[PDB]
Amino acid sequence: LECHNQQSSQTPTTTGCSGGETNCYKKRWRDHRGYRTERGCGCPSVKNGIEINCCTTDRCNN
């Protein structure tokens, strides 16, 4: 189980979650500046209005 991380588009990194986690997710929103995207491990949720996407299939963050 491993997901990739990349901060807003720029350089893609790799993150292994573990500890607990066993899932990957993608969240993004626009505030202040306005545009903020993050993709690390997790899957939780909640929100409304923002953009979120959970997936757990071998490198599903993409």
UniProtKB/Swiss-Prot annotation:
Transmembrane domains' residue ranges: none
Keywords: Acetylcholine receptor inhibiting toxin, Disulfide bond, Ion channel impairing toxin, Neurotoxin, Pharmaceutical, Postsynaptic neurotoxin, Secreted, Signal, Toxin
Any GO molecular function: acetylcholine receptor inhibitor activity
Primary localisation category: secreted
Site (May be critical for toxicity): residue numbering on this chain: R33, R36
Domain of life according to the entry: Eukaryota
Effect of K47E: Decrease in the rate of isomerization reaction of disulfide bonds
Tissue-level expression: Expressed by the venom gland.
Coiled coil: none
GO cellular component, one term: extracellular region
Annotated disulfide bonds: C3-C24, C17-C41, C43-C54, C55-C60
Protein function: Binds to muscle nicotinic acetylcholine receptor (nAChR) and inhibit acetylcholine from binding to the receptor, thereby impairing neuromuscular transmission. Has a higher toxicity than cobrotoxin-b. In vivo, when tested on rat arthritis models, shows anti-inflammation and immunosuppression effects.
Entry protein name: Cobrotoxin
Organism: Naja atra
Full-sequence portion shown in this chain: 22 to 83 of 83
